[PDB]
Write an enzyme that holds these catalytic residues in place. Structure first.
Site, PDB file in Angstrom:
ATOM      1  N   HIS A   1      31.128  78.911  76.042  1.00 29.50           N
ATOM      2  CA  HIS A   1      32.475  78.372  76.171  1.00 29.50           C
ATOM      3  C   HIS A   1      32.593  76.946  75.637  1.00 29.50           C
ATOM      4  O   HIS A   1      33.700  76.389  75.659  1.00 29.50           O
ATOM      5  CB  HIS A   1      33.017  78.445  77.617  1.00 29.50           C
TER       6      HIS A   1
ATOM      7  N   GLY B   1      31.132  68.457  83.125  1.00 23.15           N
ATOM      8  CA  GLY B   1      30.059  68.012  82.258  1.00 23.15           C
ATOM      9  C   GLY B   1      28.709  68.641  82.538  1.00 23.15           C
ATOM     10  O   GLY B   1      27.791  68.496  81.723  1.00 23.15           O
TER      11      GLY B   1
ATOM     12  N   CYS C   1      27.810  71.846  82.769  1.00 20.78           N
ATOM     13  CA  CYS C   1      27.475  73.119  82.144  1.00 20.78           C
ATOM     14  C   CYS C   1      26.318  72.963  81.180  1.00 20.78           C
ATOM     15  O   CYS C   1      26.146  71.918  80.546  1.00 20.78           O
ATOM     16  CB  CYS C   1      28.674  73.729  81.434  1.00 20.78           C
TER      17      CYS C   1
HETATM   18  C1  LIG Z   1      31.139  72.861  82.603  1.00 19.13           C
HETATM   19  O1  LIG Z   1      30.873  71.453  82.401  1.00 19.13           O
HETATM   20  C2  LIG Z   1      32.090  73.094  83.784  1.00 19.13           C
HETATM   21  C3  LIG Z   1      31.339  72.906  85.104  1.00 19.13           C
HETATM   22  C4  LIG Z   1      32.257  73.082  86.304  1.00 19.13           C
HETATM   23  C5  LIG Z   1      33.321  72.001  86.379  1.00 19.13           C
HETATM   24  C6  LIG Z   1      33.404  71.639  87.858  1.00 19.13           C
HETATM   25  N1  LIG Z   1      32.161  72.105  88.424  1.00 19.13           N
HETATM   26  C7  LIG Z   1      31.536  72.956  87.623  1.00 19.13           C
HETATM   27  O2  LIG Z   1      30.534  73.572  87.890  1.00 19.13           O
HETATM   28  N2  LIG Z   1      32.591  74.457  83.692  1.00 19.13           N
HETATM   29  C8  LIG Z   1      33.898  74.671  83.705  1.00 19.13           C
HETATM   30  O3  LIG Z   1      34.688  73.768  83.942  1.00 19.13           O
HETATM   31  C9  LIG Z   1      34.436  76.050  83.425  1.00 19.13           C
HETATM   32  C10 LIG Z   1      34.883  76.134  81.973  1.00 19.13           C
HETATM   33  C11 LIG Z   1      34.787  77.519  81.306  1.00 19.13           C
HETATM   34  C12 LIG Z   1      35.791  77.515  80.162  1.00 19.13           C
HETATM   35  C13 LIG Z   1      36.526  78.839  79.941  1.00 19.13           C
HETATM   36  C14 LIG Z   1      35.617  80.035  80.197  1.00 19.13           C
HETATM   37  C15 LIG Z   1      35.016  80.016  81.595  1.00 19.13           C
HETATM   38  C16 LIG Z   1      35.084  78.644  82.260  1.00 19.13           C
HETATM   39  N3  LIG Z   1      35.591  76.221  84.285  1.00 19.13           N
HETATM   40  C17 LIG Z   1      35.396  76.353  85.599  1.00 19.13           C
HETATM   41  O4  LIG Z   1      34.283  76.265  86.090  1.00 19.13           O
HETATM   42  C18 LIG Z   1      36.590  76.605  86.459  1.00 19.13           C
HETATM   43  N4  LIG Z   1      36.372  77.811  87.214  1.00 19.13           N
HETATM   44  C19 LIG Z   1      36.906  78.991  86.909  1.00 19.13           C
HETATM   45  O5  LIG Z   1      37.548  79.190  85.898  1.00 19.13           O
HETATM   46  O6  LIG Z   1      36.679  80.079  87.846  1.00 19.13           O
HETATM   47  C20 LIG Z   1      37.280  81.373  87.745  1.00 19.13           C
HETATM   48  C21 LIG Z   1      38.761  81.162  87.880  1.00 19.13           C
HETATM   49  C22 LIG Z   1      39.503  81.147  86.712  1.00 19.13           C
HETATM   50  C23 LIG Z   1      40.871  80.939  86.730  1.00 19.13           C
HETATM   51  C24 LIG Z   1      41.532  80.746  87.919  1.00 19.13           C
HETATM   52  C25 LIG Z   1      40.798  80.754  89.091  1.00 19.13           C
HETATM   53 CL1  LIG Z   1      41.740  80.483  90.585  1.00 19.13          CL
HETATM   54  C26 LIG Z   1      39.404  80.959  89.100  1.00 19.13           C
HETATM   55  C27 LIG Z   1      36.752  75.467  87.465  1.00 19.13           C
HETATM   56  C28 LIG Z   1      36.693  74.097  86.784  1.00 19.13           C
HETATM   57  O7  LIG Z   1      38.013  75.621  88.125  1.00 19.13           O
HETATM   58  C29 LIG Z   1      38.056  75.455  89.551  1.00 19.13           C
HETATM   59  C30 LIG Z   1      36.866  74.698  90.116  1.00 19.13           C
HETATM   60  C31 LIG Z   1      39.305  74.668  89.885  1.00 19.13           C
HETATM   61  C32 LIG Z   1      38.080  76.819  90.227  1.00 19.13           C
END
Ligand SMILES: *[C@H](O)[C@H](C[C@@H]1CCNC1=O)NC(=O)[C@H](CC1CCCCC1)NC(=O)[C@@H](NC(=O)OCc1cccc(Cl)c1)[C@@H](C)OC(C)(C)C
Ligand SMILES: *[C@H](O)[C@H](C[C@@H]1CCNC1=O)NC(=O)[C@H](CC1CCCCC1)NC(=O)[C@@H](NC(=O)OCc1cccc(Cl)c1)[C@@H](C)OC(C)(C)C
Lengths: 306, 306
Positions: free
Chosen positions: A41, A143, A145
């Site tokens: 991603h 950050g 990931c």
């Molecule tokens: C990488 O640096 C980062 C690490 C995260 C940020 C905060 N703590 C961590 O462990 N990863 C992400 O931010 C990640 C990004 C990719 C990009 C698109 C493809 C997959 C995700 N995004 C998340 O981790 C979000 N979580 C998430 O999308 O969970 C499933 C989901 C999707 C949509 C709606 C819901 Cl309700 C749930 C995080 C940042 O979002 C929340 C923490 C707010 C759930």
């Protein structure tokens, strides 16, 4: 004596961490020989988060779109490919710090050490277990990931986890180093939830043996129980079934302490049914489930790593 | 999100660990530049344990009595001296892995990471605090003496602990890297005991702020308390006095969460008086006191180290 959540020394993994930047996204990568591994991603944009087609996304990319930074030295990408949910960036320089290593996909219940990183720079190390629902209760911010989880066996680093995302309940989801998610998760910004978790019974029993090795016996009793009757109590308290194979893995600990496995099960039964009544075990007022039998033997015996 | 006992990455310290052998005693040493530091009781013999005169003991020693081993390479000792309770072995080779480093003597309540070693080989890393009674609840077996505890600040390793001995209660005693014991202990095989310990109040408050940062608020209330009236409750429950200087150190956390320090004190008061009533905070059923305010800010904000 004493008993602590011990992580593995992180030196061998610290030497492999790099910064990977693409567009407006910066995360970590793992540099082994001439390849840098990182979550796919990284190629997503803030409007792509919702339902990306990474095959489309990646064929639109050029090598020079990937900023890879190893400390104060930029590495030149000369090829890229996608394997499941990880990106593999071919670079022109082999990492001279590359340890002897394996990629391994672990079973729920197994523990590992996480080297939490930001911008290619290690922030800290801690110990995790793969929960029965294939999340990990990590400690991760934006950050992080591409931070990896790992085990060390003598001189060999076994990489088992790479961080991808955080779920609404505040637990963490990721892949093995070949990019397959642990659990049913996908790298899409879509409604996903952990699944009901359970307590890792074989590990709690390992930890009770650690407590006996360390001089706590207040929780033992003269009773015993059958595996069947134990598991009938476990399911009531949301513990995983204990298998005969679990019993066998607990053999050495049973032999070193003189406490038959099923005798420890009867202790756990009464702890489940009566609570701890204001007492502690190894400085915990909860039953601890993130030490495996192997972890207990490693720490109570003194195994090292070159 | 998430919150874990995080140790510092241990790479910079792993590169400094060596094996020191003298007579029938083998323990660890810390190789910085051309000096190897280790506990002076390495020169003790099994009949010297009781009341040694290390000055006598050391003047009877020769350089070639000290086997120093750095991996598969033996280092030649060319001089030796004793500073307080540590031995300094001058060797003919400077450690090329010597990081930027400081020696620091920490105050009770401060935390550090311990790189548990055996035979010069790191076994594991975990996080400790210096207890108010100047013991540490470590995890140490025979052979672990000369393992060090440390902190990292950007690129600089601050060594604060070197392991010497285990007390009957199973806690651990040692020195700073200039050989001064923490606490009233001495390196004699004589009847010594910890002293009554107390809970590190400022750290518990830091951890409650970490819980709020992470989404637990069940323990807050609308009440407040004065510093005086809080400390009257603390002493009853065997907590250390909270000072105005502690209040000030908790400033940033109070500012980031919007919860006045003395408001958090009123929460702690009611937790002390009512217990947790089957609930947990950050996965603990006990009030945790081995995270400092600085530790909370480091982990909830994302600070790294090159
Ligand atoms: C990488 O640096 C980062 C690490 C995260 C940020 C905060 N703590 C961590 O462990 N990863 C992400 O931010 C990640 C990004 C990719 C990009 C698109 C493809 C997959 C995700 N995004 C998340 O981790 C979000 N979580 C998430 O999308 O969970 C499933 C989901 C999707 C949509 C709606 C819901 Cl309700 C749930 C995080 C940042 O979002 C929340 C923490 C707010 C759930
Ligand atoms: C170094 O490798 C080793 C590390 C210990 C072993 C087990 N866990 C550890 O942390 N250190 C020692 O073994 C140390 C040896 C020196 C040698 C003489 C000068 C000081 C000690 N010995 C101990 O740690 C013993 N503790 C001890 O002596 O405590 C004070 C004391 C002295 C005499 C009688 C009593 Cl009742 C108490 C340990 C090994 O002894 C017990 C754990 C049984 C208390």
């Amino acid at each position: 004596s004493g008993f602590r959540k011990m992580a593995f020394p992180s030196g061998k993994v610290e030497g492999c961490m790099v910064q990977v930047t693409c567009g407006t996204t910066t995360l970590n990568g793992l540099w082994l020989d001439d390849v840098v591994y990182c979550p796919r991603h990284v190629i997503c944009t803030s409007e792509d988060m919702l339902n990306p087609n990474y095959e489309d996304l990646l064929i639109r990319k050029s090598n020079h779109n990937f900023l890879v930074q190893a400390g104060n030295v930029q590495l030149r990408v000369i090829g890229h490919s996608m394997q499941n949910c990880v990106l593999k960036l071919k670079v022109d320089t082999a990492n001279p710090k590359t340890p002897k290593y394996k990629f391994v996909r672990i079973q729920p219940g197994q523990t590992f050490s996480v080297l939490a990183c930001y911008n290619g720079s290690p922030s800290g190390v801690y110990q995790c277990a793969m929960r029965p629902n294939f999340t990990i209760k990590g400690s991760f911010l934006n950050g992080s990931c591409g931070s990896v989880g790992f085990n060390i066996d003598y001189d060999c680093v076994s990489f088992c986890y790479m961080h991808h995302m955080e779920l609404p309940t505040g637990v963490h989801a990721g892949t093995d180093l070949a990019g397959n998610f642990y659990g049913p998760f996908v790298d899409r910004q879509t409604a996903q939830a952990a699944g009901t978790d359970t307590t890792i019974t074989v590990n709690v029993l390992a930890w009770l043996y650690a407590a006996v090795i360390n001089g706590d016996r207040w929780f033992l009793n003269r009773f015993t129980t059958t595996l069947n009757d134990f598991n009938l109590v476990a399911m009531k308290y949301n513990y995983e079934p204990l298998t005969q194979d679990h019993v066998d893995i607990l053999g050495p600990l049973s032999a070193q302490t003189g406490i038959a496995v099923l005798d420890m099960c009867a202790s756990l039964k009464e702890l489940l049914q009566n609570g701890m009544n204001g007492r502690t075990i190894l400085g915990s007022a909860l039953l601890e489930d993130e030490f495996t039998p192997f972890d207990v033997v490693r720490q109570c015996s003194g195994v090292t790593f070159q």
